[PDB]
């Protein structure tokens, strides 16, 4: 069945890729109607203006929904595609980090000085982010370890932490570390009976799961993520490389980065249906990205024949399953239809 | 000597490598400890976050806004006065200063071809973005450091664009003219207007700034600014503090040092506000002294206008600023 609203519902699961398909051409494409590949070409101050709009949206440490828009809609497209990340290595992919989801990225040999100084910086960077989250005023942030994804956030205060894609072994290791969570005999009589006669006594899985932590108990999880060799890989392509941290507001050692963009034109069978494709790749697709991309489409009036809709798709969200279950303000969705009058999705 | 004075801090655009501040009155965190040697700087809860907030609110539009209200904590300004953006960064390697005459034994590093090649492609994009925003947008200024040179890009107060190069040689000046950069030559160099584009192309293309030997093999030049840019990393300077007695007399030393990176004009300006807000100035024989090192390699950067100035040492009074004229 179909579900619908005036505006895009929020989903908090981070994905790996976004694809958007339309029957109406994008502004840089308008010369062409033959099948082929097209560069997303930017013009004059559009990138810089989009960067301004992004930082102005997130300056307080949480989103301001009342900032005025830029003038070029290309700046809205640019502002949707930005984030802050640590650690930094050129030429190594830093997301996704769960070992099952890596394609075989190439080896990179590094010096012990490089790896040691990186770890020394990582501890300070992580402690700064966690301090500003708990006792300061920062909104939220993500961590992607080799075995799980973690989200720290606030309830609309009360603090909440969510862990996803755990095994029973990881659950028991966290129990040994002392974390608590709001998770989702006749054999003794037999041994006693054997001993009473004088016969010799020598004669949980539950798949993948998520976890939720409330309140003061979050600090134990913070110390656990600081300490364990379980999350610090000692063998493999990510040997001695610490976990990835991601945010939408600046932090010390954070590097500003952008997703890769490209686009294509397809034509078929002599029909009216030429199809125009946009892609955003090679990083996390954070929840604000879809919200801003909706505004890019509606500002550029591609909905004007609402009888020809535009569709959007976000991929690999199942690796972070559970991050939208803890509240009524969020939703799980995978494919979305945009019109000017509404936004629609399946019952899922 | 020529003791010179004003009400406020005069501007020096030469970039320092090291800063030292000396007082006969204790800094606020030190007040428990009453002996010589090291003491570790410590912050209360929101100091390092409110400082970052104030810093980005100052430089939000790509130039300084002087009208921002100040933080509550005095301690925020020390953190906020020591933040800057830099590309490229490798962990555990010195990125500034680059000019090969001024180097320590900088640490041995080796890297695979993949990392250096990908880093070069990223640098080629990033440099174009900074130059484009500067030439045809509101971005005020930025710095470039490189193995045999030092470059500043700025604008003079709808404005006239100026580029300055320092610490040249005969081979470097001849090589720039062979590259087609033709310039005024008052050793430093000055370029204006449309002729800046040829220097941008020469910096992008030229073999000279891309040495294939030594520790800085195949590393591109360093790019530095105060407001964010693509691939830029937010960083901070090292801080440390120290105490002495003045040779057994009742006078005493309190010392604060900032190290490991460039030192920029806004740093000294906000340091002045830190001293003038802590009420540390209020003793008559004992005003506070400030010193900056190694500005001579950047000499010439303060000459192109009357509003800039060269100085190496400043003494602070609550209503005035006094220094020896250089």
Labels describing this entry:
part of a larger assembly; 2 chains; 348 residues; alpha+beta; eight-stranded antiparallel β-sheet; seven-stranded antiparallel β-sheet; globular; nucleus (chain A); developmental protein (chain A); Downstream Neighbor of SoN homolog (chain A)
Structure description:
This is part of a larger assembly, with two copies of chain A. Chain A has 348 residues and is an alpha+beta fold. Chain A is built from seven helices and 15 strands. Chain A has helices at 46-57, 73-79, 112-134, 168-177, 186-197, 218-227, 287-299, and strands at residues 2-5, 17-22, 36-38, 82-86, 141-144, 149-155, 158-166, 209-214, 244-247, 255-258, 260-266, 275-281, 310-315, 335-338, 343-346. In chain A, the strands form two sheets. In chain A, strands 1-15-14-13-2-12-11-3 form an eight-stranded antiparallel beta sheet, with no helix packed on it. Chain A has a seven-stranded antiparallel beta sheet with strand order 8-7-6-5-9-4-10. In chain A, a hairpin with a 4-residue loop joins strand 5 and strand 6 (149-155). In chain A, helix 1 (46-57) packs across helix 2 (73-79) and helix 2 (73-79) packs antiparallel against helix 7 (287-299). Chain A is globular, with a radius of gyration of 24 Å. The PDB classes it as replication. The entry lists the keywords DNA Replication, DNA Replication Initiation, Replisome, donson, Replication. Cryo-EM structure of CMG helicase bound to TIM-1/TIPN-1 and homodimeric DNSN-1 on fork DNA (Caenorhabditis elegans). Chains A, B: Downstream Neighbor of SoN homolog. Organism of A, B: Caenorhabditis elegans.
């Amino acid at each position: 069945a179909q579900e619908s609203a005036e505006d895009l519902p929020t989903d908090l699961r981070i994905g790996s890729k976004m694809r958007i398909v339309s029957k109406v051409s994008f502004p840089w494409m308008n010369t062409r109607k033959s099948t082929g590949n097209v560069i997303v070409k930017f013009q004059t101050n559009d990138r810089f203006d989009g960067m301004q709009y992004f930082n102005k949206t997130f300056l307080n440490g949480y989103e301001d929904p009342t900032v005025p828009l830029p003038v070029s809609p290309m700046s809205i497209l640019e502002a949707a595609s930005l984030f802050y990340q640590f650690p930094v290595i050129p030429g190594l992919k830093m997301y996704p980090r769960i070992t099952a989801e890596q394609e075989n990225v190439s080896r990179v040999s590094l010096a012990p000085l490089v790896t040691s100084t990186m770890l020394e910086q990582w501890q300070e960077c992580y402690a700064e982010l966690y301090s500003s989250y708990k006792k300061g005023q920062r909104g939220s942030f993500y961590v992607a370890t080799a075995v799980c994804n973690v989200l720290f956030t606030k309830m609309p205060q009360k603090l909440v932490a969510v862990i996803t894609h755990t095994t029973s072994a990881i659950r028991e290791h966290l129990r040994s570390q002392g974390v608590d969570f709001e998770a989702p005999s006749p054999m003794k009589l037999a041994n006693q009976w054997l001993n009473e006669i004088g016969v010799s006594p020598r004669t949980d899985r539950a798949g993948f799961q998520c976890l939720v932590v409330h309140g003061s108990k979050i600090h134990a999880l913070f110390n656990a993520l600081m300490d364990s060799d379980v999350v610090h890989e000692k063998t493999g392509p990510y040997t001695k490389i610490p976990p990835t941290l991601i945010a939408t507001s600046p932090f010390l050692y954070g590097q500003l980065l952008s997703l890769t963009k490209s686009s294509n034109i397809f034509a078929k069978a002599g029909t009216k249906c030429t199809e125009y494709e946009l892609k955003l790749e090679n990083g996390p697709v954070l929840p604000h990205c879809a919200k801003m991309m909706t505004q890019f489409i509606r500002s550029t009036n591609m909905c004007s024949t609402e009888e020809k809709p535009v569709t959007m798709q976000v991929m690999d969200r199942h690796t972070s399953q559970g991050m939208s279950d803890w509240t009524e303000t969020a939703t799980n969705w995978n494919t979305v239809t945009i019109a000017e009058n509404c936004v629609k999705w399946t019952k899922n």
